[PDB]
UniProtKB/Swiss-Prot annotation:
Belongs to the glycosyl hydrolase 33 family. GO terms for biological process: ganglioside catabolic process; glycoprotein catabolic process; glycosphingolipid catabolic process; oligosaccharide catabolic process. It comes from Homo sapiens (Human). A motif (FRIP motif) lies at residues 18-21. The keyword Cytoplasm applies. Keywords: Carbohydrate metabolism, Cytoplasm, Glycosidase, Hydrolase, Lipid degradation, Lipid metabolism, Repeat. The keyword Hydrolase applies. The gene is NEU2. This is Sialidase-2.
Amino acid sequence: SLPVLQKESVFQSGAHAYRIPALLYLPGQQSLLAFAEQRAAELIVLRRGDYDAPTHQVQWQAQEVVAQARLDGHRSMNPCPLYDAQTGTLFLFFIAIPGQVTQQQQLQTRANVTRLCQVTSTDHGRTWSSPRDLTDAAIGPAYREWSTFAVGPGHCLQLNDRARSLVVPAYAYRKLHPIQRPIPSAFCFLSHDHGRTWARGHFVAQDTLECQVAEVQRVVTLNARSHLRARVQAQSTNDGLDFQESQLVKKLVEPPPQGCQGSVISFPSPRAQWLLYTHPTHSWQRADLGAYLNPRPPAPEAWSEPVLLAKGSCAYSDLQSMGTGPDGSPLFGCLYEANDYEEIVFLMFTLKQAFPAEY
Ligand SMILES: [Cl-]
């Protein structure tokens, strides 16, 4: 989007202390929660921001550490927030890894010591519950078959099915062969009971990493980072438990050989749903963050050419729809890494600003 409503650095560090953004919109409060990892143990920080209607700007409040989102002796990473519309409760899923090499790792280099955790809030994110280790309940037997894993980063998904199911995007490094290095593959964790029980979905294609999911029958579309020149996408008709054959989305470039995390969300069509996605647009560098639109999701061929949101160094990003903007079109919030990881920038713009040809 050429013109934007707001562009503000919400996290800054010449030492690259802030990375891995996660954004969550609270529709009732009309506020945003911006999460990020803070490095030197590694912790998750947060800044609350209220959408001020009179000025149509988000007023960001002081930064605070999410003290509860951590396990003793562990580093916290990959903030993955979710708003449960049925209860109003907020979930912050995250990963916890020992701060130093453990005795177990000393004997078995690839031993899994990564933990899946969560903290919840019933007061719009002002205070959080003590951490809950979901590892055993969500992963189970497969745990020892991986070297490590992660969720998100970025916002999770809640479906519009009867149960208002929760879907948490993830990926795991599978220890498929003793000599070969572990291979990552994306998948989803699924809960039909607001996080009481969890099911682990089947993996999508091999060599897929950080991913996010959106809903558009109702299908869950998973958009993942790859080591190829294009994004990998797959759709599921059973809430993410099983995905149809993965596809390469040539219209969405991925800078080889490492690729970069990107974000995707669905939003009500301005005419079903459309998809909005953000990711760097350079063919081989993490640069020039762009916004892409898919008016006939999840068809890979329907993705639009990107509109430049920010020129220069840009990496990870996270999107959130924020209701209706001042001009009458869908409002969006985007948190992204910029300037060689020296900052995390917040951008707010509308669909009309980003894709004027639509109006
Ligand atoms: Cl709310």
